Ligand binder design. Structure first.
Ligand SMILES: *[C@@H]1O[C@H](CO[C@@H]2O[C@@H](C)[C@@H](O)[C@@H](O)[C@@H]2O)[C@@H](O[C@@H]2O[C@H](CO)[C@@H](O[C@@H]3O[C@H](CO[C@H]4O[C@H](CO)[C@@H](O)[C@H](O)[C@@H]4O)[C@@H](O)[C@H](O)[C@@H]3O)[C@H](O)[C@H]2NC(C)=O)[C@H](O)[C@H]1NC(C)=O
Ligand SMILES: *[C@@H]1O[C@H](CO[C@@H]2O[C@@H](C)[C@@H](O)[C@@H](O)[C@@H]2O)[C@@H](O[C@@H]2O[C@H](CO)[C@@H](O[C@@H]3O[C@H](CO[C@H]4O[C@H](CO)[C@@H](O)[C@H](O)[C@@H]4O)[C@@H](O)[C@H](O)[C@@H]3O)[C@H](O)[C@H]2NC(C)=O)[C@H](O)[C@H]1NC(C)=O
Ligand code: HEM
Ligand code: HEM
Ligand SMILES: *[C@@H]1O[C@H](CO)[C@@H](O[C@@H]2O[C@H](CO)[C@@H](O)[C@H](O)[C@H]2NC(C)=O)[C@H](O)[C@H]1NC(C)=O
Ligand SMILES: *[C@@H]1O[C@H](CO)[C@@H](O)[C@H](O)[C@H]1NC(C)=O
Ligand SMILES: *[C@@H]1O[C@H](CO)[C@@H](O)[C@H](O)[C@H]1NC(C)=O
Ligand SMILES: *[C@@H]1O[C@H](CO)[C@@H](O)[C@H](O)[C@H]1NC(C)=O
Ligand SMILES: [Br-]
Ligand SMILES: [Br-]
Ligand SMILES: [Br-]
Ligand SMILES: [Br-]
Ligand SMILES: [Br-]
Ligand SMILES: [Br-]
Ligand SMILES: [Br-]
Ligand SMILES: [Br-]
Ligand SMILES: [Br-]
Ligand SMILES: [Br-]
Ligand SMILES: [Br-]
Ligand SMILES: [Br-]
Ligand SMILES: [Br-]
Ligand SMILES: [Br-]
Ligand SMILES: [Br-]
Ligand SMILES: [Br-]
Ligand SMILES: [Br-]
Ligand SMILES: [Br-]
Ligand SMILES: [Br-]
Ligand SMILES: [Br-]
Ligand SMILES: [Br-]
Ligand SMILES: [Br-]
Ligand SMILES: [Br-]
Ligand SMILES: [Br-]
Ligand SMILES: [Br-]
Ligand SMILES: [Br-]
Ligand SMILES: [Br-]
Ligand SMILES: [Br-]
Ligand SMILES: [Br-]
Ligand SMILES: [Br-]
Ligand SMILES: [Br-]
Ligand SMILES: [Br-]
Ligand SMILES: [Br-]
Ligand SMILES: [Br-]
Ligand SMILES: [Br-]
Ligand SMILES: [Br-]
Ligand SMILES: [Br-]
Ligand SMILES: [Br-]
Ligand SMILES: [Br-]
Ligand SMILES: [Br-]
Ligand SMILES: [Br-]
Ligand SMILES: [Br-]
Ligand SMILES: [Br-]
Ligand SMILES: [Br-]
Ligand SMILES: [Br-]
Ligand SMILES: [Br-]
Ligand SMILES: [Ca+2]
Ligand SMILES: [Ca+2]
Lengths: 105, 465, 58, 105, 466, 57
């Protein structure tokens, strides 16, 4: 980590001199809260049939989407005060901040 | 084992099961495909599992320049000392640069329009082809880097390509910062949340942790509720552009051919400027183009983006709604009546309870987007806290933040304050009429539009050696 | 590791009969930083990765 | 985690129902501040000859002990208001709270 | 490379090098041995290295009962249904129990007095034999467990071994908590910090993280400044005992034989009650028995415990003093003069700056113990913040905290309020005279002592189940 | 994994012909949990781990 530089590194290393991986790529997310897993440490809620979360059965994500999120597209309300460029910058911005890798098929 | 074609729950697959009476997927033996996110410490029975961020957390335009050293070299034009970003060598839109092509194993962009044989684009981030509106924004920022390096080359003949590349990159990063914090985040959070979570900038603070929080990767998907079911293209009088003015979203995913062969970025940028976003309402959360037919042209089955959001939060071991409410200093509803009050909607509160049993268990995305929106913002208090907290850390914990003493001179900062996204569109496209005031609010032609010549350019006189 | 389409421009500049010497050395060092030490190992990498580069050969 | 229980587990598992490893044995310590290693992620300050910390040479731990900690032991000041049991309860208590394992030779 | 004998720096060895003109180690090519703490994720270069806690964070008397299920079982007497902890089967201490012996592959206790052939003791934690004073405390709690179980058996005959064991364990755990938070921590922190960091308990909060913080494993080593250079033993008139009444500490480490063959735990306990702690002063931080001769009887060279602490903090990647000050919301000195003001000791500030160059780099233990002590405490503001914060989390984040509703009845809670460490000593040893007031402050015989008869026993009548 | 000195006393209870059957089966269960399924296995473990077992002939 050099003692004088002039521009950003590509990877983000060395932005923070005292803890040089902070904000750099290919590093773990920070946790603001302790993680909540079915088995404490690894398995997601919904993994093992019959295993409840905090006293209640886990709702299928698709089931939630069906009951709560689904609406008739003809009802769509346009935003009088936001352009579609507003949506798009947010996705562009998201792509500057985080990408969470997964294994490949 | 192959999560794309199989419904077996064995690592790393965590497929979404199908309820009875699904409106689309009738066969309960089927599933929606899902790969669990890569663990930081694979195979451990000591660590609590955590996920990886492959990008730089900083608002550094890494989606343009890449977050890894090899990729970053590949994106550059190494055939001269002009400090440029490689451009497409086969195609142009009306004389101007397109992104270079990538060379992937299973190129999804080739599976949209098979005959066109237009592969996916190569950029600093791998998702640049996912919708042509995203691609256009990417192409814009590429061109603006080349324009800047060219202008700097003229102004400073001495400079080598490294110098030109870095200086342009540093300008482009500062524009993403300024557009984001001055123009975007206020319209996300609303004035009240903005002052509370982003008070006026003081200086760099090397004790502020600038990492993306795990929860933010899920919370910032609030933006799925803004998505409109069509891609709109408008001609140079901002009229529907024939013969496909309104393309359903499920025919634009990975449709790189549409940029190259159906009129370049100009029509797409005009449609983002002159069309409204979708409004998030409690009974109109998210459209079926992303909820039923996400990526349906390039996969065995249409995905459900909202449902993937919720499965992902479980994959990442994210606490539920009440825990995040508590984190944020907001009251935690325990009953259906209390949840009703918090949501200003007892009907929605009953439907959340019927699924989840307790507000403790409501998935963070579902909870966040359910909340009523702050005055003059497009998220509620829970998401405003998560989003606002994150962006404060990205600002105050960034040594290369544009306002930080010593990054830019006072003259450079003054020049940089004059930038805006509409100007960048003027500078790098064939559009001459653009959104006024705030590009993110303006949405109606012609009342919200101006000629380009009314907008001051970025003056680079303070970059002279 | 895959050869990209835009790098096909950098084979033209190497084969250019009066291109600047310090340009053509930069491109050789670029390709040599990814394991390709000759031009014959630059066309053999473009081949495998799906392009046509016998538009130079006989 | 069973829903009724009446005694502590030996390992500390299930004390916290929502995050049942918290405070259990053979788990990573929580970090209140980001770590500071020579290389950012693993090597301790003082590992590599010549590598500074935040601008300055790393002092040998034994030198710090020699120059600051050492004193003539016959000049020891007894604590008028604490017993030696105060020392010993502290060690006992520590032994209730944390043991950091080391690899065996 | 074997870290105990090699001075080569290769993972996992991080030996302390020797400065020029060391007052004790003249051989500069020698080193003080040091194994790096086990990484939570071995061999990764994604993760930031972190260390492991092998024990339960909770104040649950896990140093008695163990923190792993196989160990916990081995500590129990499984030859009847009385719910007892296993006791030594070869030795007694005037008719009372000693801890059973462990069976270690490399046993350091056996190297302290070779002819005596007494191994280390087995307990809930592996360090119980590190000094006889610590051994004596582990032995006290073992006995107290067996006494409660015996008494509960008498009260509730139908209870089986598992029931008796668990109920006794639950009481011992409550007793450790009460002595810690009512009697001990207030004298550590002082009143001001006690109020700030440990306000009156309300209720269990399931959103409080109860984990031990990495930094606490280093900051709580403040106790090293309290260590006296001798083991003191006193007879039943509180007079010095026998031929060896004041044994240098470098001859008591792992000396289990002293408990077994030189008179039991009674004289040691008298010694702890009727001798002062060492005072920490800015010019008298730690004694040479731990700084020069730590464990010298059981290994190739004497260790330096202060030095180990600072090497360990670096091993664990701990931030320096100013970072911890900032985390606590305390001013961060930049100059020697400012450090002088903070320490109320310019001389020490100049010494710290000659070593470290900047206060940003002072190691947390060294900086923590250098601070002036809070009124009626024995740590400065920095260590008060870290220790206070930790113990607040262990209390509020513990579902079995003894005052959490549903853990004990009201009647049991009222019974528990009467317990004291002096009483526990009366009930499980041959000592008839003990510290009064607060045992941690009382230190001079006879001024601060009372007969055991004046102290009320723990009344278990509300533990009666029909 | 090492046999412990206090466990030798469990061997005594198991070879005592006048000790409650319940008591003994509890101890056999304790030893079976550590991979020792017969008394001859228990004595042998004690021997390997350094204890004199010669009063068990
Ligand atoms: C149960 O206990 C939790 C935790 O309480 C903490 O620990 C206990 C032992 C005491 O020390 C408390 O004083 C501690 O707070 C309580 O929840 C916390 O509530 C506070 C106040 O509402 C929350 O603080 C807020 O945090 C907001 C978000 O940013 C914070 O987190 C980021 C993390 O990186 C950090 O950068 C930032 O500086 C903040 O720390 C912030 O906007 C807001 O202004 C405020 O600071 C805190 O987050 C909560 N912690 C959780 C949920 O773990 C409960 O209130 C308590 N309940 C009861 C009834 O006692
Ligand atoms: C530079 O920035 C750091 C970090 O600031 C945070 O993020 C920025 C973006 C803003 O949101 C800040 O408001 C945030 O705080 C600042 O340091 C922090 O200062 C505060 C206030 O002094 C510290 O909070 C204190 O924490 C004490 C210890 O307990 C805390 O941690 C435990 C364990 O997790 C937790 O249980 C508890 O709830 C606390 O969170 C506590 O005794 C005290 O009352 C107070 O809450 C905080 O810890 C500091 N963080 C760090 C990383 O040092 C700097 O002040 C700032 N400097 C300047 C000049 O701006
Ligand atoms: C055309 C618009 C958008 C998409 C198409 C799209 C799609 C996705 C998908 C498939 C994911 C991953 C789902 C999974 O977990 O498997 C995804 C994640 C993220 N989004 Fe989406 N998105 C579109 C648009 C937006 C907008 C407008 C956003 C914000 C304003 C936005 C955010 C995000 C974020 C942050 C993620 C997670 C990224 C990560 O990997 O860390 N997206 N999107
Ligand atoms: C009564 C005598 C005490 C010792 C003898 C002794 C020795 C050690 C040693 C050797 C270590 C390990 C050092 C290393 O890093 O290699 C150690 C660590 C810890 N201590 Fe020490 N200690 C004695 C006494 C006390 C007292 C009175 C303490 C507190 C009041 C105290 C605390 C601690 C703590 C918390 C540790 C770290 C434990 C861990 O492994 O996490 N000790 N001590
Ligand atoms: C080592 O241990 C032996 C015990 O085995 C100690 O020997 C005893 O010493 C006392 C005098 O203090 C005598 O009264 C005993 O009769 C001795 N017993 C035996 C077996 O000789 C010996 O003193 C110890 N060594 C040291 C250095 O303390
Ligand atoms: C590099 O720049 C030159 C000059 O601007 C251009 O002709 C060439 O196509 C560029 N190559 C790439 C791959 O961008
Ligand atoms: C596929 O692409 C070609 C581009 O040459 C275009 O002519 C054709 O209309 C496209 N098909 C559809 C259905 O859009
Ligand atoms: C078990 O308890 C009995 C009765 O107190 C005692 O005689 C025996 O020695 C104990 N066994 C062990 C291993 O402690
Ligand atoms: Br999180
Ligand atoms: Br966690
Ligand atoms: Br509907
Ligand atoms: Br997996
Ligand atoms: Br262009
Ligand atoms: Br098509
Ligand atoms: Br995507
Ligand atoms: Br440069
Ligand atoms: Br700004
Ligand atoms: Br605002
Ligand atoms: Br922070
Ligand atoms: Br509704
Ligand atoms: Br909760
Ligand atoms: Br409420
Ligand atoms: Br609210
Ligand atoms: Br309003
Ligand atoms: Br608005
Ligand atoms: Br808010
Ligand atoms: Br136009
Ligand atoms: Br604008
Ligand atoms: Br190309
Ligand atoms: Br820490
Ligand atoms: Br860390
Ligand atoms: Br001295
Ligand atoms: Br190691
Ligand atoms: Br020597
Ligand atoms: Br006893
Ligand atoms: Br024994
Ligand atoms: Br000796
Ligand atoms: Br030890
Ligand atoms: Br029981
Ligand atoms: Br208490
Ligand atoms: Br007090
Ligand atoms: Br205080
Ligand atoms: Br907490
Ligand atoms: Br002596
Ligand atoms: Br002094
Ligand atoms: Br001094
Ligand atoms: Br040796
Ligand atoms: Br610092
Ligand atoms: Br100061
Ligand atoms: Br202070
Ligand atoms: Br006092
Ligand atoms: Br006495
Ligand atoms: Br008293
Ligand atoms: Br007391
Ligand atoms: Ca970035
Ligand atoms: Ca414990």
């Amino acid at each position: 980590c050099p003692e004088q530089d002039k521009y950003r590194t590509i990877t983000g290393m060395c932005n923070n001199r005292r803890s040089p991986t902070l904000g750099a790529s290919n590093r773990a997310f920070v946790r603001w809260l302790p993680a909540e897993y079915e088995d404490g440490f690894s398995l997601p809620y919904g993994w093992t049939p019959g295993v409840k979360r905090n006293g209640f059965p886990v709702a299928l994500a698709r089931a939630v989407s069906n009951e709560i999120v689904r609406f008739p597209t003809d009802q769509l309300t346009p935003d009088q005060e936001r352009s579609l460029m507003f949506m798009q910058w947010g996705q562009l911005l998201d792509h500057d901040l985080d990408f969470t890798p997964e294994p490949a098929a | 084992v192959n999560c794309e074609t199989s419904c077996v729950q064995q690592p790393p697959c965590f497929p979404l099961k199908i309820p009875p009476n699904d409106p689309r997927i009738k066969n309960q033996a089927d599933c929606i495909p899902f790969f669990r996110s890569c663990p930081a410490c694979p195979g451990s029975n000591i660590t609590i599992r955590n996920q990886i961020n492959a990008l730089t957390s900083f608002v550094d335009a890494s989606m343009v320049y890449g977050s890894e050293e090899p990729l970053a070299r590949n994106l550059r034009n190494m055939s001269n000392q002009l400090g440029l970003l490689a451009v497409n060598q086969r195609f142009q839109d009306n004389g101007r640069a397109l992104l270079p092509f990538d060379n992937l194993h299973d190129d999804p962009c080739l599976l949209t329009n098979r005959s066109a044989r237009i592969p996916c684009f190569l950029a600093g981030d791998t998702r640049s082809s996912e919708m042509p509106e995203l691609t256009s924004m990417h192409t814009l920022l590429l061109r603006e880097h080349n324009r800047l390096a060219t202008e700097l080359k003229s102004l400073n003949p001495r400079w080598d390509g490294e110098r030109l590349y870095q200086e342009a990159r540093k300008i482009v990063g500062a524009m993403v910062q300024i557009i984001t914090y001055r123009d975007y985040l206020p319209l996300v959070l609303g004035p009240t949340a903005m002052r509370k979570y982003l008070p006026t900038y003081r200086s760099y603070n090397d004790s502020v942790d600038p990492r993306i929080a795990n929860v933010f990767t899920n919370a910032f998907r609030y933006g799925h509720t803004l998505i409109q079911p069509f891609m709109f293209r408008l001609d140079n009088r901002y009229q529907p552009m024939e013969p496909n003015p309104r393309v359903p979203l499920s025919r634009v995913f990975f449709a790189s051919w549409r940029v190259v062969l159906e009129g370049g970025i100009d029509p797409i940028l005009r449609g983002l400027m002159a069309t409204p976003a979708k409004l998030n309402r409690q009974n109109q959360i998210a459209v079926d183009e992303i909820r039923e037919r996400l990526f349906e042209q390039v996969m065995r089955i249409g995905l459900d983006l909202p449902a993937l959001n919720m499965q992902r939060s479980r994959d990442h071991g994210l606490p539920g709604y009440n825990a995040w409410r508590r984190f944020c200093g907001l009251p935690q509803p325990e009953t259906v009546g209390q949840l009703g009050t918090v949501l200003r909607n007892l009907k929605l509160a009953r439907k959340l309870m019927e699924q989840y049993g307790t507000p403790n268990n409501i998935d963070i995305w579902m909870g966040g987007v359910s909340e009523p929106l702050k005055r003059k913002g497009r998220v509620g208090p829970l998401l405003a806290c998560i989003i606002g907290t994150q962006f404060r850390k990205l600002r105050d914990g960034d040594r290369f933040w544009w306002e930080n003493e010593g990054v830019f001179s006072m003259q450079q900062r003054q020049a940089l304050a004059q930038i805006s996204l509409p100007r960048i569109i003027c500078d790098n496209t064939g559009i001459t009429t653009v959104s006024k005031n705030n590009i993110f609010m303006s949405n109606s032609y012609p009342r919200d539009f101006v000629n380009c010549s009314t907008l001051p350019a970025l003056n680079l006189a303070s970059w002279r050696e | 590791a895959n050869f990209l389409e835009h790098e096909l421009s950098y084979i033209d500049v190497l084969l250019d009969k009066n291109a600047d010497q310090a340009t053509k050395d930069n491109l050789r060092s670029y390709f040599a930083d990814k394991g390709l030490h000759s031009i014959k190992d630059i066309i053999n990498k473009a081949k495998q990765d799906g392009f046509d580069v016998s538009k130079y050969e006989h």
